[PDB]
Each structure stands twice: as structure tokens, then as C-alpha cells.
Amino acid sequence: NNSIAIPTNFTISVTTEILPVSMTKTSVDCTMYICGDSTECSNLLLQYGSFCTQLNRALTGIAVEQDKNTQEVFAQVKQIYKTPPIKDFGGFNFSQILPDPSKPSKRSFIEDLLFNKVTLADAGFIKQYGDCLGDIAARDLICAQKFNGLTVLPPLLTDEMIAQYTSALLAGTITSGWTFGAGAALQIPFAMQMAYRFNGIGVTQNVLYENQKLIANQFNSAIGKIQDSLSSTASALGKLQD
Amino acid sequence: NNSIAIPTNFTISVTTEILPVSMTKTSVDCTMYICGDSTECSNLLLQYGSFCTQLNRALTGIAVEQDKNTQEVFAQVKQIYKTPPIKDFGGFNFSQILPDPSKPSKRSFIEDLLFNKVTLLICAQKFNGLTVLPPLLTDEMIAQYTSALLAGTITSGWTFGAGAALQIPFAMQMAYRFNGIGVTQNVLYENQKLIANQFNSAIGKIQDSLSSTASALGKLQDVVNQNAQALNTLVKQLSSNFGAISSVLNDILSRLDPPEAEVQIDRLITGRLQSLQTYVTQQLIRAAEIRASANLAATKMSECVLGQSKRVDFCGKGYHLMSFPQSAPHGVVFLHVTYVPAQEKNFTTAPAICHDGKAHFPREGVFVSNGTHWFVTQRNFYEPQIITTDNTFVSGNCDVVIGIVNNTVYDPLQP
Amino acid sequence: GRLQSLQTYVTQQLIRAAEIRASANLAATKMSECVLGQSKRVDFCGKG
Amino acid sequence: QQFGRDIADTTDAVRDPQTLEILDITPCSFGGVSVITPGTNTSNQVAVLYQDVNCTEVPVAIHADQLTPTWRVYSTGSNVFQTRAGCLIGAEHVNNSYECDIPIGAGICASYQTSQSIIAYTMSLGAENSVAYS
Amino acid sequence: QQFGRDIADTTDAVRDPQTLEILDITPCSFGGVSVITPGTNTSNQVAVLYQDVNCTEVPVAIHADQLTPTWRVYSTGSNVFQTRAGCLIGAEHVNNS
Ligand SMILES: *[C@@H]1O[C@H](CO)[C@@H](O)[C@H](O)[C@H]1NC(C)=O
Ligand SMILES: *[C@@H]1O[C@H](CO)[C@@H](O)[C@H](O)[C@H]1NC(C)=O
């Protein structure tokens, strides 16, 4: 009741949190699935009422929902900010998360690792589904019809489009922090931005500036640790692979 | 690395958020639906097990839930407050959202726009074994809860949500609410008339937006449409024979005797029972959708309305000040009042200041210079203030910080 | 049989859609609070 | 044409074969019935609610004329009150307003109090308050 | 061998009993179509999208020999555009975003 402990030091820890957003958009042609190319069966299906009219309506509702799910999480800023050409953020090192213009697509270096952690190899229907678009030798290869009416609609927002949102979000956060999400983006040095963010934790600003270089090294090394976790055999993308 | 943008202005944005709270309560009877007034069919249905009890029990679980959903969303305060007759809120114009007794209904104006913008043989389906139980809380009473919530918010602010209501002038309530955004009270009082005009105009634009043909109540209208098509489909399935000779039980019992009519009548029951099973299962999933929305609506009122929430983009776009709840058909409409920063200006900034070989940091604000002289200013607004030892705290020396700049800090007691 | 199989798959999809949608709403909340601002909610935007 | 059908393929109209006059068919009055019970621990008095049903065709629902005398209470008595939820029997309407005990629907609630009977009333939203704002 | 079956236990390969050759099976139904149109009160113009269907294979898939002229106009013309989501017919592609 008369003894307290107060930290004399700190460590900047970066952790990865993975959350599913959208699932595969699938549509089923009930007449084909249940009565594939059979006129006699189709007549009998009508005797069962408008059952699968609901199913198409239900699946369609899910299909549009996925696009809404992706939009409401990524499409939160209508301004596509771009990172400045000079990467002078007070010693902070964002190359491993910012987009790489050298690559044909705008995906950042870490996003490349994430895409490689999810594979369709352990899948029969889906894996052979993609190969159809790459088949030219086969005559009249209409694979929208070969799978008993089971088709996978493409996402409304392609991967390249989504990557632009994240790059815009990173650019706004890096150069403006929190203002851009609460109005027009406000430029501010990254050293000042973190100083305010520290001030929100209850530690005065002088802590950051007095050892700004030390903090930058801690963050850069912390980002490096994510590389080993993701670039190695360790598969932390269990919430998306499932 | 040495440029900052400090807004010199602001804009009070009153955005609207729409959330479903409850859906139409429905109850279905097996006998009316599957075996309508038929003794032979009903006697043959009871041997299918306790499916029907599950159907009725599941729907009643939904029906009571819908009544509950409205309770958390609206019945947050057990005290019904009344706004004073005198509308003296420092120029703020509340008459167009508080209840107006000049109409037979005790709803308010913005509340009435909403009821007219949601469109509800509908009664014919109610006579085919389908019943629509009325909500426990009627529209007039739900409107009284919102009026009570408003009367507390304007008169008492957030105190009434944390215990006994504490009357406070609305000018001061907004003044502290700026203080919670990090905005000093002097900003509001120096331009109180400007803020009121923006708020008054902001509410007006909501009326014009809703009064026009732009139907933004898609969510609430979707709930009505979703329920309507589900019921319409459910009754429509009674016209399908499911492989039987006819889709009407009465004809089959008339043209066929029991011993060979058992095959036909059983076919209809399986099809009708399956269709009813599809309806309840779909309804149960929808109830979860509404329940999640109802919890979100209750959460928003608890935080956005009953207090000021620091959660970004949770209680409106921008720095949220305070919200107003409004009753709507099968849902609730929030009028989030947010403090949106406005016109900016370039400024040269340094992390600290070095005067007597010692670094000075801003107690609350940032160091800015408009070209010739350095000033310490608010982060969310621009009121330049002279650098003083009482406005800055010293920590360390000047050879450690990067970006520090020479400047003289005025001592408030030296002269 | 096929209709029930198709109906069962659709029903399971709806349940999975809600779980994903619930996760999506949480993701938007985290993006709204953790990314676009600083959150004081403990253990909501990391550890610490 | 001789038969008119609705969306559910149920004949909602007909023509009399004897005389060529258009004749309408509407389903007979029906609805669910609910019972308001204060609790077997408290007492055994019960009020029965006929949901969304006119009070004018309550007794015809059953053959109470040739039934046990206990079933005659539905053909007489002053405990017959009409509500938006339906026809309520076994409870008396009271002008006063109290907190909801047994929710009924349409803003009315039932409770048991004291000679002894079940009362149906409009639920009170809460203690009336008037903030002394100035 | 006499015949081949796929994962769903449906015929997908077979050998000619006479020449004992190798041949495959190519089902042809073409039920995967969508309709794009604004409000009917606004206009009657409609654009049709065929999911994951090659634009060049539309005339063969549609079985034009048994189609009305109203559908034939949707198999060829100038307003034919190929997209990763499928073939879009009846809509004029534009550079602007
Ligand atoms: C900021 O960047 C400019 C760009 O060249 C440079 O001249 C200046 O020295 C930098 N200042 C600090 C404090 O990093
Ligand atoms: C929409 O339809 C209505 C008919 O109810 C018509 O009056 C109106 O002009 C139409 N508007 C458009 C843009 O098509």
C-alpha cells in the first residue's frame, strides 16, 4: 500500500490482426442443378412452387452483401492520397508496407506475402474452375455450364483496386494521421504526429523527441519481425484460409 | 518535415444515420396453413412430430425479441423529461425536431417526414393463417421516448444518462462538448451566433433532403420489403401441388376417399411444411441481422446521444459533438452533429523551441510560424498565442531534439 | 434430395454470411477507430 | 367464368349456379387466443385475450350453451373489453396508468392487484419529469 | 476402358465403340446470363452481360439457328465489349472514370 512501480523504458510493439471481410460470391442455377438440360424434370420442378426463386434471391442477397462488406471497410475515404516522393518520416521506415511502383501491381511488399499464404491447391471445384479461362484448345469450352450451374461471381472491387484504398489510407495516416478521416487531410511531420499520439497515451511529448531515433529503430525492427513470421513456414493466415 | 496545416475555420455538419431496430412480428399456425380447417389433414399432421411446436415457439421467440429490441434502443431512461416552453438555447433552433402539439400526433416534424417516406392485398394475406401481432410500444409512445431523450439532452446534456439529470445551459453544454474535442471553450463563445446559424441551416438541409424525391431510407424500406416478399412467397406456396393432383385440400377430400387420399394429402403437407420451415429459418437469420442492428442502435444512443463519443466515424463523420434520436418506422434515425474542420492554411512548425539552451515543448498545441514569428496554437483551430513559460514545459536540452529552432520565449512576470 | 441438398447449402451460406458480415463490421470499426484515429479501447487496436 | 381465386389459389369469389349473381367468399373470422396468468403461486384468476378479433363473435367461438356452466362466463359479465390487440376477457379497463407487468400489445399491459381482479391498463412510460432548465 | 467419369460421377470422357478413339463431352445450355437496365420509367435500353463467357463464343453458345431476331442483335454489332467479369453487349465502353 506504499510501493509503486513505474516503467523507465518502453518498447514499440507491432502485432498483426487478421479479420475476414468477404467470402466467395456463388450463384446456382436451380433448374440446371436439379434438372440439368432435362425438359421433363423442369416441368416437375415447377410443381414444387417457387422454392429456388428464393434460393437465387437469397444467394444474390449474399452476393451483393460481400461487395457492401468490402466497400464499408476499405472505401472509407473518397480521396486517393499518394505518398510523397521523398520518404522523410523522421527515421521511420515504411517501404515494407507502402506500395512498390516497381512491381506491375500496386500491392506493397507485405501484401505480396499475404497473397502467397492463401492457396487454392487444396480444392477440386475451384482450382479447375480457373483453368477454363486459360484453355483455348478445347472447342466450345463453356465452363459456366460444366459445373452443374455452380458459378463464382467476381468481386466488384478487384485486388488492384483494393490495394489503392490501403495505399491511400496509409498515405493519409502517414502524412495526416487522423485528420483525413475526420475532414480534409492535414499535412503534419510524422515526428509531430507520433508526439501527439504519445500525448494521447499519457506520456509527454518530450519522451518521443528526446529518443526519436531510438523509437524509429524499434519500429523498423518490429516491422522486420513480421517478415520472418510471414515469409517463413509459419502460417498465421488461419482465419482467411478457413 | 517542417510544414503543418492548422484550420482557421470550422463547419458544423449534421449528418443522418439510419438503423433498423425491429421488424414486423408474425405468427403462423400449422392448422390454418398446412391443414386448413381439415380434420383428416390435421389428424395426419400430428404424427409428423413436434415440428409445429418448434415453428410456433421459434416465431414467438422472434416476436418477443422484436418488442425487446425496441426497449434497449429507446427505453434507456425511465424518466420522461419535457423541454421547457421557452426555446432559449443560445440561438439554437430546436422547434423543428422537438414534438409539435399543433398536429393530432405528438411526433415532431423531422419524425413526420420519415413516416410518410416509408410505404407499408396486404390485409388479404392476414386471413390465411398469417397474423401480424402489433408492436408492444406504439408509434406515439416511441415518439415520447425520443422527446424525453431530447429534452434531457438539450436541458441536461450527458448528465441524465449517467444518473440524475442535471440542468445546464445549452451554450455551456456545447462549450464543454468542444472542450472534449480538444477545442477550448473560447472558440464557441466568441462565435456562438455563427455556430447556431450553421446548426440551424444544417437541420434545414435535412428537411429538404428528405422532403425531396431522394429516398435515403433504403434500410428501413428494405426491412418492410424483405418481410413483405417473404410473407407473399409463403402464402403463394399454398397454390403449388408439390406433385399432388391439386393444390387445395378441400377438393382432394371431395374427389377422393381417405384410404387413397392419404398419399395425396401427405404430399402437400411435406411441401407446405418444408416451405413454412424455410420461412422461419430465413426469419430467424433476419432476426439476428436486426438484433445486431438493434444492439448497434442501442450502443449508438448510449454513447452518441447520452454522451460524447471519442470513437472516430462511429457517431458521425468528423469530430462528433452530440446526436439527436428520431423515431422512424421499424427503426431509429440519428442526427449526428459533428465538428468538421474547415479552411486551412500553410504553417511552418518545429517540434520544440530553444531559448535558454533548453528545449521548450507545447503544453497543449503545436508550434507554428506564419513566416516571420513563431506561435503556439491549438491543434484543431488557429488562435496564435505568444510563447510563454506558462504555455510550455521544458524538458532536456536542445542538442537532442531534431528540428528544434532558436526563438525567444516571453517570460510573463519579468516586466 | 437435390433440392434439400441445395437448400441446406444455401442455409449454411446465410449463417456463414452473418459471421463474415459480423467480422466485416468489426473490421470497419477497427479501421474507423484504429486506423483513422487513436483508440483508448484497451485490447481493441492491439496489445498495449 | 364462375370461380374467382386469390394469389394463394383459394376461391375468394363465386357465382351462384341457380342465379347468375356474383357472390363473394371471405374466410371466417379466426385468430389466436392468449391467457394472462398472474401466476399459480399468486392466484388462479386468468384473463383470456382473443387477438385481433371483434368482441361481437367471441361466444360463438365455442358451444358454451350446451357446455359446462364454467364456460358461460364468456357470454355474460362486465369483464369484456376491446383493445387494439384484440378482445380481452377477464380483466377490467382502468383509467389509471402503471408500470408494465404483463405486456399485451399496442401499449397496454395487464397486472393483478386489489375486490381482487386483473386490471388492463396503458403502460406508464415512467415518472413524469420536467427539467428546471434556465 | 469404356467410359470416363468426373468428380460428380457424371460422364466426361468416352471411346468410340467402332474406331476405339478418345473424345470428350461438351455440354451446351447457356443459362448464365444477366440483364442490365435503368428504371423502366427512364428508358427501355438494356445491356446484357454473360458471366465468364468468351465474346467470340456467344454465337455458338446461343444456338442462333433457333432464336428470334430480337436476340440476334445481341450476338453481334459494334457495342460488344469484353470484360474480366464476362462479355458485355449493348453498352458503349468509355475511357473516362
Ligand atoms: C526536412 O527536409 C528538407 C528537404 O531537403 C531538408 O532540407 C531539411 O533539412 C529537413 N529538416 C529536418 C528537420 O529533417
Ligand atoms: C419514373 O416513373 C414515374 C412514373 O411513376 C414517372 O412519372 C417519372 O417521370 C419517371 N422518372 C424517370 C427518371 O424515369
From Swiss-Prot, chain A:
Disulfide bond annotation, renumbered to this chain: 30-52, 35-41, 132-143
Site feature location: Cleavage: 107-108
Effect of residue 151 to N: In strain: Lambda/C.37
Domain of life the protein comes from: Viruses
Outcome of mutating residue 88 to H: In strain: B.1.1.318
Region of interest (Fusion peptide 1), residue spans: 108-129
Start and end residues of each stretch annotated as Heptad repeat 1: 212-242
Region of interest (Disordered), residue spans: 120-145
Consequence of substituting residue 148 to K: In strain: Omicron/BA.1
Impact noted for substituting residue 56 to K: In strain: Omicron/BA.1, Omicron/BA.2, Omicron/BA.2.12.1, Omicron/BA.2.75, Omicron/BA.4, Omicron/BA.5, Omicron/BQ.1.1, Omicron/XBB.1.5, Omicron/EG.5.1
Location of region: Fusion peptide 2: 127-147
Residues glycosylated per entry: 1, 9, 93
Result of changing residue 180 to L: In strain: Eta/B.1.525
Role summary: Precursor of the fusion protein processed in the biosynthesis of the S protein and the formation of virus particle. Mediates fusion of the virion and cellular membranes by functioning as a class I viral fusion protein. Contains two viral fusion peptides that are unmasked after cleavage. The S2/S2' cleavage occurs during virus entry at the cell membrane by host TMPRSS2 or during endocytosis by host CSTL.
Protein name: Spike protein S2
Organism in which the protein naturally occurs: Severe acute respiratory syndrome coronavirus 2 (2019-nCoV)
Gene label: S
Residues of the full protein shown: 709 to 950 of 1273
Swiss-Prot record, chain C:
SS bond list: 34-45
Purpose of the protein: Subunit of the fusion protein that is processed upon entry into the host cell. Mediates fusion of the virion and cellular membranes by functioning as a class I viral fusion protein. Contains a viral fusion peptide that is unmasked after S2 cleavage. This cleavage can occur at the cell membrane by host TMPRSS2 or during endocytosis by host CSTL. In either case, this triggers an extensive and irreversible conformational change that leads to fusion of the viral envelope with the cellular cytoplasmic membrane, releasing viral genomic RNA into the host cell cytoplasm.
Record protein name field: Spike protein S2'
Protein's organism: Severe acute respiratory syndrome coronavirus 2
Gene: S
Range within the parent protein: 999 to 1046 of 1273
